[PDB]
Amino acid sequence: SRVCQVTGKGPVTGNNISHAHNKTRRRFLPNLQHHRFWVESEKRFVRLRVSAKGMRIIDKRGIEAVLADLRARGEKF
Amino acid sequence: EVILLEKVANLGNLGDKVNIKGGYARNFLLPQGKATVATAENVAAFEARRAELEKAAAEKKAAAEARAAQLSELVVTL
RNA sequence: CUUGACUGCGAGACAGACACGUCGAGCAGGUACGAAAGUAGGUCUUAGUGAUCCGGUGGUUCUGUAUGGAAGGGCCAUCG
């Protein structure tokens, strides 16, 4: 489903207030894309569907640290 | 934000910290072994290996001395 | 000649379901005219209009979320 595999960001819900203040149920989707991340210590790519906030977290913490606790949680890659 | 490891870039240096775009660090330099993100965890390991930068980077331009002599022969029969 | 087309009110009535509305002697403060009694709170009279809630503007003694201020609110005057 549309959850980031790094952050767990799924879709959330809210409203669509008009100028006459009609509220309508919409939904807020994460900016999740597919990205291949190079791991040196495995000599391959892993391809995980992450948000852009997850991309920034990979940039800050390293792919090895995030890929360590993806599998403690028990994700695919 | 990255330490370079090659001197033949068009806006690169030997080992100077340059701050670049995120895609250029992310998608090209780091998966090809030519840069590494400048982290504050192993910086005292870099200064005890500075004499490793001379040998391969001198040998690389020294191997192209006799490498370009076989490419311009024009002996390829199409 | 000139600003009484004043300010604070207001005894008492008229009208009237209510919200509204109508008239007003007198008192205080300041003024017009008039030599002076006095007249003057618009126009001979009755139409010429629009509630509240929102906003805007000028004051203010009031408030002002720990305190000193502000913000916002309140009252008074006013506009859409």
Place this chain on the structure above:
RNA sequence: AGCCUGCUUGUGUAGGAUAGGUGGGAGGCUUUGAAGCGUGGACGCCAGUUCGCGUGGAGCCAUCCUUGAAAUACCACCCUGGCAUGCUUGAGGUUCUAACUCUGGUCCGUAAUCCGGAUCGAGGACAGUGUAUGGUGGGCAGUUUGACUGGGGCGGUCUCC
């Protein structure tokens, strides 16, 4: 479009010759300020000015010498016509490959037209998706569409004198 360097170029009335000025500054004498005419390089609100003076180690602009609203030589500070470039940024075009995409080939998981992985190819920072935003939008939706009235519809009338 932002910033800097030597800051060189300032040609009106009148001033031989120059006005954007501020202070040490009254004489410039470091080959004077190499000089009378002048070779070539530039430009001129045009015959105003810089350097190889044609040769050479040489007194010309006379620092009120006039004149002009402030005078030139000395020496520091900036900007203006702006010379050049990088330290940058913002919009286009082209190109590259490395993100990304492929409802392309070939291997492999595998006895699989799925799906992954590897590789080749092709496109390519476009496409596409997230979020924000203008536009369109009866495709769909929730509603509204007044009263009086010799029945209703039409016309007329709604407040005030």
Place this chain on the structure above:
RNA sequence: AUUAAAAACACAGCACUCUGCAAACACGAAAGUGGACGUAUAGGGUGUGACGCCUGCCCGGUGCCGGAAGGUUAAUUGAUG
């Protein structure tokens, strides 16, 4: 279906218009699937309705298609007061 069998709908034929393929288009929050294991002589939509003779005028409105690039104009910028 159970008061209307028709002049109604359909139809071959016709014309307009869309669509270069991961097609236009449809159903699907999506994946996918139909179109189609088809490929412009194909496929969707629309109107007309065999055949014969024909199918006139108007581009103002509205739509659709193309065109400069001038005004307007949104988020976002954040000068200045």
Place this chain on the structure above:
RNA sequence: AAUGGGUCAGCGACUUAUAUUCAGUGGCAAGCUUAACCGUAUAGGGUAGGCGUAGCGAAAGCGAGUCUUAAUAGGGCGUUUAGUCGCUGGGUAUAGACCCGAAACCGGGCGAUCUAUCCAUGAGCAGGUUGAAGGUUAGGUAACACUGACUGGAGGACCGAACCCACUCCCGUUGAAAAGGUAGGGGAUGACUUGUGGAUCGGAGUGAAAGGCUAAUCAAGCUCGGAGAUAGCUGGUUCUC
């Protein structure tokens, strides 16, 4: 000659909670009263809180006064003898709020055994006509055009049974039948009819299109919930003086 009731016997409509106001009736009285809770528990405790003993002002504030005001003037409101807590009635508020009664809206399922389309796999169409294209043959032309004879056996062809349909009349209308029967009628080798299995479903299907059909239901199925929707409407509301 408006409605309603065949009749009888049962049932069937002003409730309850919590806040409050007024009356009546009690207890205490410048005071009254407790709520949770504690309690060997309808006691006793617990006075937090509520109302009253003071009002005026929008407020700061000031107070038997206060506000307005330039005003010790006017004017507004207030000021010597009672309130509070029960209990029982009459009202009111919020609750389905005296009872019954819509059409409808929304949410979750259930249905394509009827039907509309489609998919797969099977099978039905007695009998009689008509005689297309092709061929063969004789003619006939440079081969071609073109004529006869024989053959052939086409077709959303024709007449007609089964089958499928449903145009007309009459009957039937409390039917034999919630859509039929009897006489006649249309198609009947196809854009046919049909069995069996499967697919599509409720702002959603399918539709040679009629708002047709989707289980005798259709301009938005059925069922269960929101739900005792809502009804300024209709009907009803029970002993006595």
Place this chain on the structure above:
RNA sequence: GAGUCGGCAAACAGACUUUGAUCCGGAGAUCUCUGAAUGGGGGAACCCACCUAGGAUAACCUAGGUAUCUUGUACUGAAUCCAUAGGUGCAAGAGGCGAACCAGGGGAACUGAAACAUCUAAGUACCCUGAGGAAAAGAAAUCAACCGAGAUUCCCUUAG
């Protein structure tokens, strides 16, 4: 401690019990097929299997196993060299049902406003996912005004 062989269902047979039945409680034994249903299918209560061990004379029978997933581990190993995916075997655990209570995800409309859009109804009803006997929350980056109080939950007030 004297009757009994359950009930509608009273009788009747053949019987059982003082050497102690029936009856009552505790622990076992058996426990067919279905159903999460789990060997594979399936139209629930049916159909067809495989492997191991033992017994059975051209027919079988007994007792065990044989689902998927997750986690852990062992062995094995593709493209591809190394090792990764993948695959086989073991161990442990799960799944389903239940009126409510609880924490979350998604979430109406009638209704009221005497119409109706903001608003209400209402984060209600409904659907979904987890957990427990309760859950949730909880030990101050909390409130108070210069005084102080100290986690959370629940109740009465402040107060309509």
